[PDB]
């Protein structure tokens, strides 16, 4: 009846401009049990001088909208119609639940009948500083049937 477990993907450090960049940095969340909360942290423009000045988030309306595969296209889709009963609070620690505040959170429901995979991107690869390029952070959420 209550959630006591959370998976956290936190890119706070991994997307900084690097000489090897841009690189893909991946965080996979595989869920196969009910009522798991998922929290994704991505750095904000201006959180450090330079370093994130051109960061972007995909989908811009995460977590309500996610990237997911439909045929041979990655499409932006409403999460609440991909997975019925998911809980998304409008705010997270009194701020908008949106990557413009640095954090998104949602809680998966008691039952999922079909394997469902979706993605979020925190993309720093347009930020350039001193010959270095930021990285592209990708979160893959892989929900297996449960309940």
């Amino acid at each position, epitope marked *: 009846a209550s959630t006591n477990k959370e998976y956290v993907c936190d890119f706070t450090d991994q997307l900084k401009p690097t000489e090897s960049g*841009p690189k*893909v940095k991946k965080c996979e969340v595989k869920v196969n049990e009910p009522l798991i909360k998922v929290k994704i942290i991505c750095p904000l423009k201006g959180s450090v001088e330079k370093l994130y000045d051109n960061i972007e988030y995909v989908p811009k309306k995460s977590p309500y909208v996610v*990237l997911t*595969k439909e045929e*041979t*296209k990655l499409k932006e889709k409403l999460l609440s119609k991909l997975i019925y009963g998911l809980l998304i609070s409008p705010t997270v620690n009194e701020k908008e639940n949106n990557f413009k505040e640095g954090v998104i959170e949602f809680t998966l429901p008691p039952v999922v009948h079909k394997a469902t995979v979706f*993605y979020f991107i925190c993309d720093n690869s*347009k930020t350039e500083d001193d010959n270095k390029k930021g*990285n*592209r952070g990708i979160v893959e959420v892989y929900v297996e049937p449960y309940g």
Partner: nanobody
Amino acid sequence: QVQLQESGGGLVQPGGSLRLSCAASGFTLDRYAIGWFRQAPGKEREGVSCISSSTYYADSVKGRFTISRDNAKNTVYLQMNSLKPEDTAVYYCARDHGPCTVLADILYDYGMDYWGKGTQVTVSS
């Protein structure tokens, strides 16, 4: 004044060849990944190939298409051999600040910018 210009389209018979050109104007494209996409009329655009600053090939063109980059010519090429009628479509090129990114065997295109106007490819007997 940044620009990407596709050319090389044409009309051939099955088994023929074309070479598509993606020419950069106003930046050097070897700091960017370059992706080739195609859209048959009425259908969804699909990834064909990508070269980063490895390489991506859609399963359907493996062994027939080759992507390459000429740093001096500020151009990325797509050599298309053994063309089939299924390859008919408008072909587009675009640039990505990030690496060629593939998720679930799909070329990720949300980072793609400065899409060229496109070049027509027709394979018919």
